[PDB]
Amino acid sequence: KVTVVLYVNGDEVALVHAFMTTASLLAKEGKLVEKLILTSNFTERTVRRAFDLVRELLPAKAEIIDALREEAEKYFAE
Numbered sequence: 001k002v003t004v005v006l007y008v009n010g011d012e013v014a015l016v017h018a019f020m021t022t023a024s025l026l027a028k029e030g031k032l033v034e035k036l037i038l039t040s041n042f043t044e045r046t047v048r049r050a051f052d053l054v055r056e057l058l059p060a061k062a063e064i065i066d067a068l069r070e071e072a073e074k075y076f077a078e
Contacts, residue, residue: 003035012046019054023061023068036071044076 008018026033038047051069055062 001032001034003037004033005037005039008038008040008042012042012050015040015042015047015050016053016057019050019065019068020058020061023054023058023064026064027061033068033071035075036068037075038072044073047072047076 004022006018006022008015042050048069051065051072055065055069058065
């Protein structure tokens, strides 16, 4: 169980690409994240909507994407 700090430049595209590469990287190592810290220029809403597209475009990792999305919502809940 790991706590991940993620920085993503750019816009919603870079955040969507970074979530896929993260979820696929976590799936290979079998490592699970207990807390996600997201540092970037996007609102809480754009982060949630990004996560939705990650689940749609990468359904084989949808279980990891949903777990990371809850932690991002809980992180942005401060």
